[model samples]
Target: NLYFSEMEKEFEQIDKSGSWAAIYQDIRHEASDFPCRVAKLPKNKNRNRYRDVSPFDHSRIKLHQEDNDYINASLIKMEEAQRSYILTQGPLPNTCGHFWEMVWEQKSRGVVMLNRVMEKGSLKCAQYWPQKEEKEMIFEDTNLKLTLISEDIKSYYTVRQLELENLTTQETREILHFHYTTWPDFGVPESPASFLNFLFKVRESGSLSPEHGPVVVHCSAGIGRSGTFCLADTCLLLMDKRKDPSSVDIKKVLLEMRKFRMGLIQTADQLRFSYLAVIEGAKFI
Candidate 1:
């Protein structure tokens, strides 16, 4: 089938339309009225990294702790694609503990971080994990400890093996930390291949499988870059399973995902990049 080439033509048509906004604005308009009342509560205000980027109340992940269950995270489940992702904002210094608590409670096997701790002189994300020299980090609030066991650094990304322990119960589980170090704030990666290579590497680890819990994906706000990553992965996965690859409608798929969380893909450029990435990824399937 000419599915890949058709996607290329679709990309061109969108580009020729003058801006990603022509389409992106509609996406925003469609989701403008979705209820996100939970994130606006006085008690939950501090839990959010950005005031505007709040998780939809219905699809947000809740902590089991008493009296508090707010986190700037959404549980996006793509049932047809057989994938689920916990899209969250980068941990605030204080919410770092809650971040760990969510991971522990959710039983997530992998954490896909698409941005760095600091980007362009700004503290985009807190240094949530321990450095290699430090070896271990303890979160007093969550009663959890994260130990850095190993790290494999690449030019664009880093794969780390971390041991997470519940101090109270002494139960432990291994978590894989996939950090993509090169992608920008509102931009895509240098190229689709590089991003896909990183995606493939994460897939090879077996962490993004249905057998494991949802993979935690985040950048600064968890909408722009995180959405792009999830969109491409999901589309490629659906393409892999479909005999009629052309049947996959990328925009409709994105619209469905946006229902679970507000502002999944931020910019038109990010949307276009997702199309390109998904098209490039279909070759492998």
Candidate 2:
């Protein structure tokens, strides 16, 4: 409780400083020139949840030789930090197939999902994965099928074991989906303790380890909540190694990360929230 209280005070300081807004605006202006036109091609634009929020051409994750090579996804690589992530929007009904196709081709070991199927009484994402046995969720376009082999539901999250198979080539692989159910869109969670608990769960599974493929992280838009998680995970890793917390500048790291994806750390609140999480997670890591 003391840590949580201190976290609130930390957020208040950032709130009063009014610096996060300026930094966020700078990120937005820089993002404006990121050549997102690839997502605007006549055939590719509508697949995105928001017309304006598209991945930069340079960092966009292209499906392996897929026709058009477009998906509302960005592969962000933090090479220096030994971390990689595929930041993508919640799969659209039509693009759901391409979502799995990218996973299959990229060989991602796990998917870290931050939002639920619906939020705020709106359809934030499709039921892209299967729910139970005898139910095979097929992404008809990619010829990829997903079946729920097992599920472990927790107090605030659910860990599901999914079987991803390429119906086209008949190649099969198992993927883990770690769903943090309590996180809300455009909002912070109840506490950083809960968030880091979930983060450690993913870490325990060796999902985020580089030995496995880059993990896929997505929220409704794949920037705000997704960015928060990646930032917390990355900064904590840095702090744990350096033995000097100040050596890791959270804002600078976020700006650097945005180079690989457009509009990372969407709002000032989310930026402040990222700092709170990084500081909180540092204690444990």
Candidate 3:
């Protein structure tokens, strides 16, 4: 029946040209040169792989001593030379020990903050924050409407979930669903192909309703998966405007994102890889 035929089709398409390869290429080009490497590791171990570890390894005792000596000597030299110095400390309670911002100003009839900090044990002490209360405050205080995607997926009932939260629901103020678990083995249940198809379905639904707003998406840190999705979506939007080549403005879009958050899409490799995904997917168009 339908199940067997669908299974047969899936088997036949299991080759490189089908969904799996597209997922591989998407991650390979959009995320990192070593997406598979991280994909193979456990989540915590995977994150550690990206962290700089030289400073923390006490095994390099001699190196640390030498560095400390050098710093003391440099300080003395600076004092003797009457050098002026400017020392500044960064903001405290450093979530991920990094500061970031994202600023968008198009008079959004609605505001969507795509965040994912809701797993039971996923967030450590410093990362955990209640989003519902925050959204309530925003809706109560500002003209800005607030829509939030909770860390709990089951809470997502429909697009009206945005409006119910007092977020903007106008055609020009669409809030897109954002989540980072879309990355392989991160958290989401579906494959990238399935996810992309789901997004398209959402977009198509919005198109059917002129009052619908733009999709807002975000994940734990908001830079990794969120950036990939934004970049891919932007590129696709640009492709649609090919008739007006002058309308293309990748830098403007990226810069605006950067203003709101540092490391908006930190690595050049990540940004480049996202475009590659779009390019490969172009064949389907």
Off by over 4 Å in 1: 1-4, 17-19
Task: Please report the candidate that would top lDDT against the real structure.
Answer: 1
Model 1, span 1-285: residue lDDT tens = 234466677777777766677788887787634778989999887788899888988999998878688898999999889899999999999899999999999989999999999889999899999877376899998899999988999999999999999999999999999999999999889899999999999899998988888999999999999999999999988888888787788888888899888888888888888998888889897
How many collisions per candidate? 0, 0, 20
All candidates in order of lDDT, best leading? 1, 2, 3
Q: Which scores higher on TM-score, 1 or 2? A: 1
TM-score of 3: 0.37
Which residue pairs show backbone clashes in model 1? none
Residue 129 lDDT, candidate 2, scale 0-100: 88
Cα lDDT of model 2 by residue, 172-208, tens digit? 8989999999988888876888888899999999988
- Among all candidates shown, the one with the greatest TM-score: 1
Q: What TM-score do all the candidates reach, one by one?
A: 0.95, 0.90, 0.37
Q: Whole-model lDDT, candidate 2? A: 0.84
Estimate candidate 1's alpha-carbon lDDT, on a 0 to 1 scale.
Answer: 0.89
